[PDB]
Amino acid sequence: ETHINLKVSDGSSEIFFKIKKTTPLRRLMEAFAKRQGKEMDSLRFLYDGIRIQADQTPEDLDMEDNDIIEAHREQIGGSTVVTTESGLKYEDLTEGSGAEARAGQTVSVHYTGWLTDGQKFDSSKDRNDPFAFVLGGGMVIKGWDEGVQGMKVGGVRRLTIPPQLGYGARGAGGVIPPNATLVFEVELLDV
Ligand SMILES: COc1cc(CCCOC(=O)[C@@H]2CCCCN2S(=O)(=O)Cc2ccccc2)cc(OC)c1OC
Ligand SMILES: [Ca+2]
Numbered sequence: 001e002t003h004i005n006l007k008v009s010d011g012s013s014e015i016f017f018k019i020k021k022t023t024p025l026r027r028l029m030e031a032f033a034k035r036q037g038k039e040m041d042s043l044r045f046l047y048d049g050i051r052i053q054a055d056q057t058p059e060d061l062d063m064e065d066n067d068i069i070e071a072h073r074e075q076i077g078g079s080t081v082v083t084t085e086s087g088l089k090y091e092d093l094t095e096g097s098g099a100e101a102r103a104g105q106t107v108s109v110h111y112t113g114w115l116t117d118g119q120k121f122d123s124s125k126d127r128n129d130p131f132a133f134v135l136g137g138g139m140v141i142k143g144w145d146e147g148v149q150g151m152k153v154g155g156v157r158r159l160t161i162p163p164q165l166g167y168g169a170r171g172a173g174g175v176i177p178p179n180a181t182l183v184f185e186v187e188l189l190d191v
Contacts, residue, residue, distance in 0.1 A: 001065070004058055008032045008045070010071040012183070013118030019058065026054035032071060046070045081160075088146050089160035096152025099191045103136030103149055108190040114183045121175045130189055141166050143182070151188040159184045 006017045006028065015035065017028045025045070029052070033040040045052040047061055047069050073093070081091045101107045108130045112123040124131045136145050143161030151157055161182040163169070171178045 004063060004065045006058070006063065006067055006069055008069045008071050010036070010118070012114065012116055021059045022057055024054060025052055025056050025058070029054055042074050044072045044074050046072065084146065086146060086165060087162045088143050088165055090147050091158045092155060093158055093185070094154070094156040096155030096188055098153025101135055101148055101151045101188055101191050104134070105191050106132055106134050107148060107188065108132045109148070110187045110189060112185050115176070116181050116183065148186060148188070151186070153188050153191055156185060156187045159186060
């Protein structure tokens with residue numbers, strides 16, 4: 001057996017790779033990152049709890065067919081996922097430096113939204129068009145009205161929105177199913 005199959009999971013997306021046992025894992029890591037639209041260095045890949053280095057081969061690490069590699073977002077400082085009393089979760093990926101978003105203000109953001117299996121359902125960046133809304137105004141889903149509060153301009157926050165703070169039992173747009181948890185990455189551009 002000259003080749004093996006490896007699964008990379010980021011906790012949402014699961015992608016399989018067929019690779020020669022003597023090929024550096026760089027190729028797999030770069031192929032995985034390419035798909036998620038990121039640079040290989042923005043991610044950490046773990047095998048058996050140990051970070052993979054790009055020059056290492058499957059043979060080097062004694063990997064077997066159908067072994068699993070976990071992909072985590074590089075977050076140097078270390079992050080904290082916050083869970084509020086409503087059940088909303090959020091994590092500041094980058095802290096802003098600018099003014100703070102407060103309820104009642106009109107704010108402008110870029111965003112991407114995904115389902116929990118990793119499927120992208122929308123992004124403002126796809127239309128190169130920042131999105132403005134009145135924070136706390138009931139014109140966006142509740143998880144946004146809560147979750148964007150306290151962001152500072154320049155900040156990137158990742159919201160994990162349970163369905164009662166999203167589209168509930170009815171879903172949305174022929175794409176978001178009933179009872180969907182939603183993941184958004186939101187960048188605050190202006191307040
Ligand atoms: C269909 O039901 C509703 C629709 C709206 C319209 C605004 C929808 O947009 C959003 O709230 C979120 C957050 C802010 C940016 C846009 N998103 S969004 O999820 O990406 C909208 C979307 C795009 C593509 C397919 C399905 C859904 C508001 C709602 O709440 C006031 C709704 O009730 C839960
Ligand atoms: Ca706009």
